[PDB]
Each structure stands twice: as structure tokens, then as C-alpha cells.
Design a protein around this ligand. Sequence first.
Ligand SMILES: Cn1nc(CC(=O)Nc2ccc3oc4c(c3c2)CCCC4)c2ccccc2c1=O
Ligand SMILES: Cn1nc(CC(=O)Nc2ccc3oc4c(c3c2)CCCC4)c2ccccc2c1=O
Ligand SMILES: Cn1nc(CC(=O)Nc2ccc3oc4c(c3c2)CCCC4)c2ccccc2c1=O
Ligand SMILES: Cn1nc(CC(=O)Nc2ccc3oc4c(c3c2)CCCC4)c2ccccc2c1=O
Ligand SMILES: O=c1[nH]cnc2c1ncn2[C@@H]1O[C@H](COP(=O)(O)O)[C@@H](O)[C@H]1O
Ligand SMILES: O=c1[nH]cnc2c1ncn2[C@@H]1O[C@H](COP(=O)(O)O)[C@@H](O)[C@H]1O
Ligand SMILES: O=c1[nH]cnc2c1ncn2[C@@H]1O[C@H](COP(=O)(O)O)[C@@H](O)[C@H]1O
Ligand SMILES: O=c1[nH]cnc2c1ncn2[C@@H]1O[C@H](COP(=O)(O)O)[C@@H](O)[C@H]1O
Lengths: 336, 345, 337, 332
Amino acid sequence: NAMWESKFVKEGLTFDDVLLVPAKSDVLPREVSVKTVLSESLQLNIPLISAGMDTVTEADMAIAMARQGGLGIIHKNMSIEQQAEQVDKVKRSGGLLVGAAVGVTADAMTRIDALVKASVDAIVLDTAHGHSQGVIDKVKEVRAKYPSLNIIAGNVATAEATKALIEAGANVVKVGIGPGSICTTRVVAGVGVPQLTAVYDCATEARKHGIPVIADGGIKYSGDMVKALAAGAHVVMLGSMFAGVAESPGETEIYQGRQFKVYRGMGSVGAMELVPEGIEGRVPYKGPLADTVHQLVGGLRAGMGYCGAQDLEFLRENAQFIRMSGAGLLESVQIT
Amino acid sequence: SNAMWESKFVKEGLTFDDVLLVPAKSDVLPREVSVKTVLSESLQLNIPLISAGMDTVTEADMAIAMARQGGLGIIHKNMSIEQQAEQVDKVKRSGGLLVGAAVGVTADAMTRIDALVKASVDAIVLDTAHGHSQGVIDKVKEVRAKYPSLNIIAGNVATAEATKALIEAGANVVKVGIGPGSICTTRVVAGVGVPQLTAVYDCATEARKHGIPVIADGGIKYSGDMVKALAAGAHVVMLGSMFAGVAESPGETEIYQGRQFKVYRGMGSVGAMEKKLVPEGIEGRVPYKGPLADTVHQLVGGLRAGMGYCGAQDLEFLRENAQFIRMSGAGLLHVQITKEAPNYS
Amino acid sequence: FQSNAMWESKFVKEGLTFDDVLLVPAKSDVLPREVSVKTVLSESLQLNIPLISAGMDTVTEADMAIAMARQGGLGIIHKNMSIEQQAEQVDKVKRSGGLLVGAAVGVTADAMTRIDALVKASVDAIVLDTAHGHSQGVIDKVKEVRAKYPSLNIIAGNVATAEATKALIEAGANVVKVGIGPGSICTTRVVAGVGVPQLTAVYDCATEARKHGIPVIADGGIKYSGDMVKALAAGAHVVMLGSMFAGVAESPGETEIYQGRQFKVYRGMGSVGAMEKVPEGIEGRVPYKGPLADTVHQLVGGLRAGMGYCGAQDLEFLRENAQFIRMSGAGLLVQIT
Amino acid sequence: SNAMWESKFVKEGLTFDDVLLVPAKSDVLPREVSVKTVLSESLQLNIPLISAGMDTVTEADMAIAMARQGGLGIIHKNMSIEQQAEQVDKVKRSGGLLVGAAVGVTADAMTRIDALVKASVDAIVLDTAHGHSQGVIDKVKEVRAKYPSLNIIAGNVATAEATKALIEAGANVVKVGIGPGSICTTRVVAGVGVPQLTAVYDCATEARKHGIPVIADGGIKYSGDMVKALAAGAHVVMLGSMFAGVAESPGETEIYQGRQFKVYRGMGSVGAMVPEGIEGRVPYKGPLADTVHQLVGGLRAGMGYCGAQDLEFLRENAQFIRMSGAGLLVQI
Ligand SMILES: Cn1nc(CC(=O)Nc2ccc3oc4c(c3c2)CCCC4)c2ccccc2c1=O
Ligand SMILES: Cn1nc(CC(=O)Nc2ccc3oc4c(c3c2)CCCC4)c2ccccc2c1=O
Ligand SMILES: Cn1nc(CC(=O)Nc2ccc3oc4c(c3c2)CCCC4)c2ccccc2c1=O
Ligand SMILES: Cn1nc(CC(=O)Nc2ccc3oc4c(c3c2)CCCC4)c2ccccc2c1=O
Ligand SMILES: O=c1[nH]cnc2c1ncn2[C@@H]1O[C@H](COP(=O)(O)O)[C@@H](O)[C@H]1O
Ligand SMILES: O=c1[nH]cnc2c1ncn2[C@@H]1O[C@H](COP(=O)(O)O)[C@@H](O)[C@H]1O
Ligand SMILES: O=c1[nH]cnc2c1ncn2[C@@H]1O[C@H](COP(=O)(O)O)[C@@H](O)[C@H]1O
Ligand SMILES: O=c1[nH]cnc2c1ncn2[C@@H]1O[C@H](COP(=O)(O)O)[C@@H](O)[C@H]1O
């Protein structure tokens, strides 16, 4: 009963537990490189990805997002004809990078072939529990058929889970069980892993093979995104921070004179229409997408200025965190 | 020796909110998992739930509904021996269903237990605030001598030593929990208690040795807290606050702010004792939930998902192989959640 | 060789308070209402119940001190009055039933004068309260008194330290008062950044006062019945309450109505108001709780239950055998009516 | 290698609210303690309080009132060079008092230092969000090269390595703080910061091997926090928020919801110039001396418990005890 013993040993860290420690710097924030590479085929100018959710990313979002340096993932709560159409639309809008989300359905192989012929750069094979034989075998089918296609599998929270996917044929791994804003996995199932600890553990596995890791969910401030990138992620993925953007799908509701967008989990009652592990909410209208990106990539250049990082690689390997108490982060006057 | 003096502050405690389950390799879907459990040779549940023997939570109706779902009801003991034997027999008249009844450590305890046996009760629940007592121990021995085949659920405890005590006194099952109840003020009035997750783990660890199942009793708010409990060594969880608002629970529904409410009170509360006192329970109100079946579906639904993340095809696999990860207070905690308007009727 | 010990040890010590721990149940076949809560501070000083009301002008005067003694406890009459009036408050208590009584004196020039008046008034114990008991002036004050009154019960405080407790014991003190900072009306921790978590302070103090068989008093920080149990179980013989007794019928001062609700004034001795008749006390208000008896009945009832879970027949077993478990903030966490 | 990779989450950090000061044996009455302090042969303060170099906190009126309480004011740089040099001289002619002036790491830096030295300023404060840069080190070396006896205060830093590097560039005094500030959002926008107590200790531990003092800057909300910061190795502390609402502070009283407030904002906020400071309001605290009285009042109290006759005893002998959140836990 070795297992009985290790039940409560492991320990986890979230974004609010740590801070990056400043180091010797001779590179200015405006001078750094926030560029990143997921593969030969996938090169990003800014390490940002919009989430494959029906309230975050359609063709307009992926186009806006591509034009910024990043990448959008067309959600799959759509007919196959429609998704390939939106993919083909983004692709021909200047030869932009687009990604698309595929379920681990029976139909998935059919959906993937439509997306490949519409010329997607990367498909996202995402499910709630990416450490399942269903997903492993599914990746190996897709990899057998398309040995050059960028595959992003998830979701995973552990290194053994990460290893299983890399060997199945995954060249990018997506991290996060529990942490998303609209996520209720932990409340309803008791399951999940602190996102910083998740990213670090998974990155430590992927680092050996040289595979990029996506941090997905739980990000609220540019700060948390700098932390995700220094914890080992190549790239972060946002839902709530883009849902209120002008280029996301769906229109602007007005309630009491204030502008709002709907943001909901893909496993909430709406996106499904087996208990729900997603919820439905509203987010404030944030206007143009460029506004949100400028702030995020600005904050990133500051953090990398503090850490002495010229590029994201220097950041991932050398950056040092410091742990604190909860008392600690109340240290981060009524405001106008 | 001061060995007791310098060990005053060594032990650490964990509760539900300190931990999360860690996803593992899984080949099993939530709909194919087995939520069956065997408390004993004679007593088997189709779902790991037991409604608590409280006068606001469980009577004959709730036991019948609980059984129908594949769980078990514990008919509370705030009533005559005659009218509790009434309720026991009624559950058995309704399709030979499994039913429990609570019996406190008293003088009339045996007179009460007897009547229950003649009504063909499946399990008797020996409940005391402090189960780690000779008084309780020698009462469990008395019942085992007179009824060798009777299921005995004896509690409550929080330590391994208490556990092995009741097992060797002839109890089939141990009910774990000092202080974690929603309506419990034992931790405030007496400064006494163990964080439930540690108490379960500690008690189960001793009880596995004897092949004895334990029950996690109290402190469960969400369904995820229940997955956490089962995964910590418990065979079955016990619920009061979540079953109180349910329509099949004892008590009139009351209207406040147009909303309907039901009364949930501790058995150690002032009102419950009246059916110079230092109470260790409080009276409150919980919202009307509706039918029992809708509440159970969400609980079991969250269990299956949780077992699916862990790769447990059965509850025994979860008990033995599941792994927790500890977080800080920050770890337990933009988008405004949209909740639909209420039903006034 | 220059030592770097002090510099490196700056952040090593760790502290616990009441909310940080819970008591673990043990085997126990003593019922709560059959436990002995009798306690012995000295042969001269025996209490039925382990309770002492604080020497504050908002908490303890004659009528209060009578009430406490009669419940089996003890009142420490406060020193914010003339010597002549303090000694007459002590007399009134002493001659109504032959009750035990305490009396507060500060380390001052006219302290010795006050003590004799109080000793002549047949006081059972005097309490030498200073904000910092580990001072040379306080230590020399205790030798000064022990020398002249070798039969007198002396309580010296406040201390937070094992050293400090050793220091006051060696000066001749029968009983030690423990507490720097944990007061409800205290702002020492905020205006000066000084203090020790009450549970650790007690534990660390009693650890030293055990070697000499000297009792300690847990001074402040108790908000709930269960926190008193935690104090006694950490090494204290007795506990001193202020806030809890301040809003009681036998308290000095009358009942004020605030938004149609009955209240009483409770203020620190270091607050501006007490000082006139930099502050490290503030003034507040506490709910009117009625007569002392019901508050004592719930605090003693709460101890009885605690000793019942722990298997403690008497306060000595609890003090020597009770084991705690540490929890976290989430472990400290329905519509109550 | 894998060394940097495994060191990522190893370090722990403490802030003011994490700890308290352990009362030791005491000979000393609060009124008899010496709160005097010496930065430099050139520079000495009767109290350990330095007024922050911000457009919301300090100008010539504030600097004068600081000096006359026993401390120091640091004239901010959001002004013309000869406007700043005129502020420095107005304080100088107001009774031969102590003044400092903030200076940025730019090309006009040396041009502005020439004017400030011309008005006989005592110390300059080279302030940057990131003092551990080659820019600041190179600037310090070239000022130390030209003005060898000018007191140079350099920062901010948060580490020993940074502290060491500035001492070897020529800084007499080292300023410590990245994140702790009340108007600071560096933690939130860049995820970067170091808990102040751990920072001052780690920076003092390196500084006292050179006889170099450190300033603890920001995060101070209580007098008890100042006692804590001095006891972890700081000679002197710098305050912004607790000085913004006083009368001698730049601007004047303004009214929100019919109460009196004074605007208080960071130098990296939108107004004072991506933002890392914010803009807000603090209550009109009244005159400077009343606030100073309560601060130094608190310090005498804390030195009393710890038994420190002077700030050196405190710095070398004070012991902390760590606690939890429930440890930092009557209608007042
Ligand atoms: C996070 N999440 N969760 C869900 C619910 C869900 O699928 N939960 C869930 C929980 C646990 C699960 O455990 C396993 C699986 C699994 C799935 C799949 C295969 C066997 C192992 C969801 C449902 C529909 C659409 C989207 C989502 C979704 O995004
Ligand atoms: C803290 N802070 N930040 C800022 C903005 C700022 O300079 N941020 C910033 C962030 C990150 C930074 O990282 C580096 C540097 C740097 C600067 C400079 C040296 C190289 C490394 C500020 C701007 C104007 C006036 C005052 C301030 C200021 O006080
Ligand atoms: C927690 N609690 N407490 C009480 C009051 C109570 O009995 N408290 C209590 C406290 C502490 C106790 O300690 C012991 C015992 C005991 C009992 C009995 C056996 C010896 C040791 C209660 C009363 C009736 C019904 C239920 C309860 C109850 O659930
Ligand atoms: C907590 N407290 N503090 C105070 C203020 C106070 O005395 N503070 C204080 C602080 C620090 C102190 O340090 C010492 C002493 C001392 C005193 C006494 C002499 C030895 C060294 C107080 C004053 C008058 C009456 C009551 C009180 C009081 O109860
Ligand atoms: O239905 C849901 N339940 C739980 N997680 C979800 C659901 N829908 C999306 N997610 C995850 O949550 C992330 C968005 O979280 P956010 O970035 O914090 O808003 C997505 O990238 C998904 O990985
Ligand atoms: O008055 C009481 N005081 C303390 N615990 C109680 C009292 N009444 C019931 N309990 C326990 O609390 C459990 C219910 O806790 P809950 O599921 O969190 O609401 C019951 O099954 C009992 O074991
Ligand atoms: O003004 C003061 N400042 C700090 N502590 C005080 C002051 N006055 C009384 N005390 C202490 O506070 C205790 C009361 O604590 P309470 O029971 O939590 O309110 C008394 O026992 C005194 O020792
Ligand atoms: O704009 C800003 N962003 C971040 N920190 C600042 C800014 N302006 C001033 N500071 C720092 O914050 C200190 C004052 O912090 P306070 O005493 O908590 O208000 C100053 O002395 C500076 O070191």
C-alpha cells in the first residue's frame, strides 16, 4: 500500500502564491522579443491564443488575433461545413494562421479531413480528461494519417499524462484541469491541479522531448500570464479576457446602460444544448481586441525587463519565483 | 515524561477545501462506473449515500425515497420506541427496502433496539458525540452478544485508536466525524475536533486492517467534497444539510421573501433537545430543493465524473489508488455568474 | 570571530494562536458534568473555576469582584482609582462572605504605598501589571515586595517569553501573567509591531514555569468558550477575561442604547480615556449580556465538554495530556436563526 | 543544466503582516531611546524618516517640514532642472537644512546633477523600477567619478546581488523595494515583486558587509511596520502614502463626497507620466508633525519592548516570530 501513503504528500501552487524575482538586466522592455515557436509550421509573434469556445473565437476573432501576432482556435459547436468555411475564410484573409477545435467523436476523423483541406495550421484535440485511452488512440490515428499536421492535445494536469500524449503523436500539449473561470470541475468532481504547479510539472516532462506547453485558463491579469510563461509554458490561452472583445462572436447586450458580452463554459447547459462542469455568465464590453493585447504584451515586456529576459526561452529556463503567504498578496488607498 | 508535552502541536490537519483530486490514467467513462458499495455481508447499497438520523432530515418518507434511489435512511430517535418501530416497519412494508434507525447510549437503548429488530431493521446506528468511550464500547459489546447477526454502525470518532476500539467491540461499521457538521458548534464551544479529511483518512487506515468500512459524516457542501471523502478511505458518506431542503424530508415548507425554506437543526440544538444547557448545535433554514431524486442525481453525477478523472471503475479502486494534492488558501479562489430567477411556487 | 547568530535567527521562530489549532479527542469515560475544574494557584489561593476577571476600569470593581468570587472565580480590582478607594473596594468584597479578591498595582514610586494599604485590607493577591514585564524595573519591584511581604500572593506580567518567565519567577513571583499583544482592545501589534501569538506564548511560558511548579495565566485573546479550553490545555492553570465580562450586569458602568440595542463601554487601559483618568489601547462597545452567572455557566459548560472529549478528570490531566492538531485558514471555515 | 529549473519555486518571502517582534529584556524607557541614525559622514538624521520623491508627496514645503522634524525630504523630478534647483535652494536658505533631489537615468541626468550640486544638495536619489540594470550601474559610476563626495542613493533593488552591484558602482546608500508600494501594480501587471521584509533583510545582510545602510521604501501602512522594517536591517524608511495627506504636501485639500482628501498617485501612473502605478485619494491627515509624532511615537514603543537603546541595537538584535493569517486576526 505505497499508494495509501502518498495520498496527501503532493503540494500545489497557484498564480497568487508566487512572484517573479528581479535579476540582472541589460535589455529594455521595448527591446525584448516576445516571439515563440510551437513547431516549424507554427511561429507566433506574440505568445497568445484565444480559447476555442463559441463565445470567444470565430473567423473574425481568429483574423483579428492573427493580425496581432497570435492565433485563434475556431470552436467546434458548429457544423463541419461551417467550420471549414470559417477556417478557409481566415486563411484567405491574407494567409493568416488559424487553428480549429475537434472533439474526440466518431465524426472527428471526418471533421479533421475537412479542416486539413481548408488548410488549418493546427487542430486542437481537446477533452476534459486528456489522459484517457480514447484520446491516446485518437491522436495516434490522426498522426498516422497526417504526419505533418500540428496536433494540440489536452487537457492534462500531470507529467505522466503529458508523456502519454507526446508518444501518441502530439507535438503541442495543453495544460489545465480545474482552473478556468467558467470551470466548476473542482466544485462538482473534486478534481484539479493548481495551474502553476500543473504547468511546471508538465513542462518538466515536455522539456526533455522539446515539446511546447500551452497554459490554458485561470489567467486574470497580464501578471499571471508572465508567471505562466516563466513556469514553463510557451504560450497562454485565454477565454474570459477575450470574451468581452469586439471581435468575439455574439453581439453586445445592454443591461442598465452598461455593455456586456455573454461568456459561457463549453460544458455548461447552453453549449451542450452527465452533470455540467461549466457555467454561464456575463463579461464587461472591452472594445477593440488590440486594446487588450497591447496591455498583455506590454505587461509581458515589463516582466521580462525585470527578469533580464531577452527572449521567452531565457525566461522559461532562468526565471525565479518566490513563494509567499496569503497575507503576502494583500500587499499587492481608495482608487479614483 | 514530557513526551506528551512536546507533542502537543505536532499533528497537522486537512479538510475538504485544502485538497484536490489529481487526474490519473483512465479508460473508463462516467456512465460505466460502478457506484455500488458493500457495508457488510448483509447490507449492500446501490449508491454511497446515507441520509442522517436527524429529526429535520430523515423520517419514514425520506428512508423510503433514499432506499428507492439505492441508498439508506436512518430514522431518527427523537420519538417513542413505538412510533420509531412504526416507521421502520413501514419502510419494510413498501417493498422490502433497506432502512436504518438511530439508537443513543441510554437505558432504554435495548428496549428500543429490540422493537427495531422485531420490525426487521437492517442496521442500528449507535450515536454519541464522543464514541471513544468505554460506555459506548461496553454498549456495543452488549448488543453484539444479544444480536450476533445485526449490523451495528457505531460513532462518532476522529482517531485510529478510537476506530480499532469500536471494531474490537464488535461494530461492523465506524461513523467518522467530530466537529465538521454544518450546524455544529463543537469546535467553537469546546475547541474540540479534527479536520474531516484527516479524520476519515486516519480512521480508514486503521479500519482497512480489519476489513471494516467507515462512514464520512458531515461537512459536505458540494458533490466534490463527497468524491474527496470516498477517495480518502470512506465507503459511504452521510448527509444532513443537503437532504434537509428536499421535499421528502420531515418538516413543513415555510415562505420567506416569497421563497420557500425548510428548517435544518442540529440534534444538539435547543429546539431538538426540548422534543442551564450548553448546546453544541444550531437551528437554521435551508432552501426548498424539491424532490430527493433531483438532488441525488447531481451528487452521483459528480461522483461518476470524479471517478472518471481518477480512472476508478469502482469505489474500491478510488479508495485505494486516488491521489490528493494540497493547496494554500489562495488556491481555493472578472466573470459575473448568471443565475435564473427563483420559483415562488 | 564575530557571531552572526542573532542576525540569522531573526525569522526562525513560528507562532500559533487559538484559531490555528483544534483539540483532539481521546479515550474518555468521564462525563462533562462530573469533571473537576478546581484549580490551585497557591495554597493561599484556590479557585472553584479557572476564571479571572481583568483589572480594567470597564470590567472589574467591587460588585463584579464579588460576583466572580461567588461563582468560584476571582476578580482583580483595577488601579485606576485612589489608594484609599481601592482598599475600601477590596474590604467590601472581603467582608461580604469571606471571598477571595485581587488588586492591581503598577510599577510606580507610590506602588509600595498602595500595596500596604491593600495588604492591610486583607487582599489575597496583588497583580503587578506592566506593558513589558521583562524589564529591570519590574524585576527589582518584585524582589522589593517579596522581601517585605513574604506571605503575599504576587502576579507579575506581562510576559511572552521563557526567559522573561524565568526572570520573574527568580524574583519571587508565585503566578505569572502571559500575554503581549493578543488583547481584543489592544493595538500594541499595530502601533509597535510587537507581540506573541497567545497559544505559543502560553506554551513557551508554561514550559519554563513547569520546572518550578509555577502556574501561568492566559491574558486576553479569548473570544469563544472553546478558546479558553485551548488556553488551559496549552499549559495555563487559569485564564483572564476582559471583553467577555465587560458587557455584564455586574460590570462597572451603566447600559447604553445603540440603535435601540443595549450596550456597555469596554476600553483598554492604554486607551486615551483611561490614560487621562501614544496609545496602545482603544475604546469600544460590547453587547449587554445580562448577569455574570449565565456567561460563567456557558464558559464553564464549554470547558466541561472540552475536558469530556479529552478524557480529563481535572485541569491537570488536560494541561499535561491534551494533544492538538494544526489546521489552516480553510479549516476555520446555512441561514442561522 | 537543470539547476536553474529546479530552483524556481524554492525561495520563500515574508511581508510585514507575516511577523511580529518578540519582546526581549529591557532596561530602556521609550522616552530615553535614541532614534538618531547616520547614513553618511555628510548625512545624518534625527529621525529615520525620508519623504518620498513624488509629485504628490514632496516639494520645498514638504522638504522643509521634514527637515525640521528631524528627517529628510527628496524633491521630485517631475519639474524643470532649474525649477528643482530653485526648490533645493529655497530649503537650503530656510535654516541650513537637509535636502535631496530625485534624478532619473537619462541623458540630462548629469546636467541636472550639476545644477543640484550648484545649490549644495546633500544627496541625490537615482530612482528606477529596476536598479539592477547596467544603465543605473554605469550612471552611478560616472557620477561617483565626477562628484566623489556627493551622497548617492541608488535603487530600487530587492536582492543581495543587486545590492552588491550598486555598492561597487559607488552608491553610499541603497534603496530597497520592488512591489510593496500601495499605489503599485507591478505585481499585477508584471507578476514581479519581492515581499518587503525578506527584501530588506536580504539586502541588509549584504549591505552590512560594506558598512553601507539601506532604505526600506514602500508597503508601510502602520508605525508597527516601520519598527519591523528597521529591525530587519533598514537604517531608514521612505514613506509615500502616509505623507500625501498632510498639509505640507504639494497641491492642496480637495473634496470628495463632502469630505477632505488629497490626491495620491504613483510616478508610473497615467497622470504623473503601460501603467504600474495607480491614482487615488487619501484623507487629509492634517499637519506633518502630528503624523510624525505618532510614527516616532510608535518606534520608541517598539524599541522599548525589544530593549534597544539605539537603532543599531535593534538592527542587530531584534528577533521576529512568524505567524499565519488567522494570527493577524468588540465594535470599535
Ligand atoms: C471541461 N469540460 N467538461 C465537460 C464535461 C465532461 O466531459 N466531463 C468529463 C469528466 C470526466 C471524464 O473522465 C473521462 C472523460 C470525462 C469527461 C472522457 C473519457 C473517459 C474519462 C464538457 C462536456 C461537454 C463539452 C465540453 C466540456 C468541457 O469543456
Ligand atoms: C516603478 N515605476 N515604473 C515606471 C515604468 C517603468 O519604468 N517600468 C519599467 C518596468 C520594467 C522595467 O524593466 C527594466 C526597466 C523597467 C521599467 C528599466 C531598466 C531595464 C529593465 C515608472 C515610469 C516613470 C516614472 C516612474 C516609474 C516608476 O516608479
Ligand atoms: C455534538 N453533540 N453534542 C451533544 C451534547 C453532548 O452530549 N455533548 C457532549 C460533549 C462532550 C462529551 O464528552 C463525553 C460525552 C460528551 C457529550 C458523553 C460520553 C463521555 C465523554 C449532543 C446532545 C444530544 C444529541 C446530539 C449531540 C451532539 O451531536
Ligand atoms: C498595553 N499597554 N501599553 C501601555 C503603554 C506602555 O506603557 N507602553 C510601553 C511600551 C514599551 C515599553 O518598554 C518598556 C516599558 C514600556 C511601556 C516600561 C519600562 C521598561 C521597558 C500602557 C500604558 C499605561 C497603562 C496601560 C498600558 C497598557 O496596558
Ligand atoms: O465547460 C467548461 N467547463 C470547464 N472548463 C472549461 C469549460 N469550457 C472551457 N473551459 C476551459 O476554460 C478555459 C477558459 O478559462 P479562462 O481563460 O479563465 O476564461 C478554456 O480555455 C478551457 O480550457
Ligand atoms: O447538534 C449537533 N452538533 C454537532 N453535530 C451534529 C449535531 N447534529 C447532528 N450533527 C452531526 O452532523 C451531521 C450532519 O452534518 P452536515 O452533513 O454537514 O450538515 C449529522 O449526521 C451528525 O453526525
Ligand atoms: O490598553 C491596553 N492595550 C493592550 N492591552 C491591554 C490594554 N488594556 C488591557 N489590556 C490587556 O487586555 C486583556 C483583555 O483581553 P480581552 O479579554 O481579549 O479583551 C487584559 O487582560 C489586559 O492584560
Ligand atoms: O508609480 C509607481 N509605481 C510603483 N511604485 C511606485 C510608483 N511611484 C512610487 N512608487 C514607490 O512606492 C513608494 C511609496 O509607497 P507607499 O509608501 O506604500 O505609498 C515610493 O517611495 C516608490 O518607491
